[PDB]
Amino acid sequence: VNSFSGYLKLTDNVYIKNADIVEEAKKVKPTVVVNAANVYLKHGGGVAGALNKATNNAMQVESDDYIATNGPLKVGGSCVLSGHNLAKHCLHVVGPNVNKGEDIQLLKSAYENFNQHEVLLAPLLSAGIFGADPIHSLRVCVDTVRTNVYLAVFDKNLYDKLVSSFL
């Protein structure tokens, strides 16, 4: 038993709540929050920029030191850093960016990083809010992650509808 609430059981190990992942994290303070990051860990906007703003830029400061030491992540890769005031840890995961011509098959590799953690609060990766992409991000998540994943989806229409289209 954990402290997640209003999470609609999607499968044996996948759950979802109509929520902003940043606000979910502040309330729950989970062991692991997933950031939908880029390879440079430049948290300018989206979940990344909003989580970082919620850390008062401490996430960015820590990330810049990580990159200066280790260089960029791989598309499909991840690193574990501090969760600051939002979680014990933040798992920064990079899904393919199709607008950069990056192969979306790498989305499965991205979700495989979740299997190294027993429980995670996560947003949708390589999805966005338009077309069959966000819908696609969920199918790969369900078919790839075996650990317990709590998906926060901020957009209601997508939340409402991913549920209604879920096989």
Ligand SMILES: CC1(C)CCC(=O)N1Nc1ncnc2[nH]c3cc(F)ccc3c12
């Ligand atoms: C793009 C994608 C990652 C996948 C589908 C989805 O809804 N996304 N965004 C978000 N994901 C998680 N929490 C969120 N909080 C928010 C608060 C806002 F004002 C605006 C957007 C979000 C948001």
